Amino acid sequence: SSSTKKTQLQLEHLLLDLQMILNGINNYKNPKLTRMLTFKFYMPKKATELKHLQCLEEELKPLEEVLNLAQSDLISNINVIVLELKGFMCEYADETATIVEFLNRWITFSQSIISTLT
Ligand SMILES: Cc1ccc(C(=O)O)o1
């Protein structure tokens, strides 16, 4: 179906856009990266369905704000995608995580859903 085809394509863009952010952070010099790792992200208790993307949506502004602060367009792609994919009350885990743990969680989420559509 057209909605299924669009969904798979959007998740693929989401996955790659998240990875591109992570790659960029991984390219920070060590002292800068060390400081970036002090920032905390809330994490989904459960993330197995598109509706769970609400847990990502609520952290997109913090994500983009810290990236901007880190430098003294990918987020815009992600914003549209997450909004449209999610179409519910988000449960968060008790413990927060670093930007690296946060991005890896949502990259893994994206691949998991993609693998149910291939
Ligand atoms: C990365 C990629 C190439 C083609 C597709 C797709 O069929 O969604 O995805």
Ligand SMILES: Cc1ccc(C(=O)O)o1
């Ligand atoms: C991303 C983000 C928002 C707030 C924080 C923090 O105080 O660690 O980190």
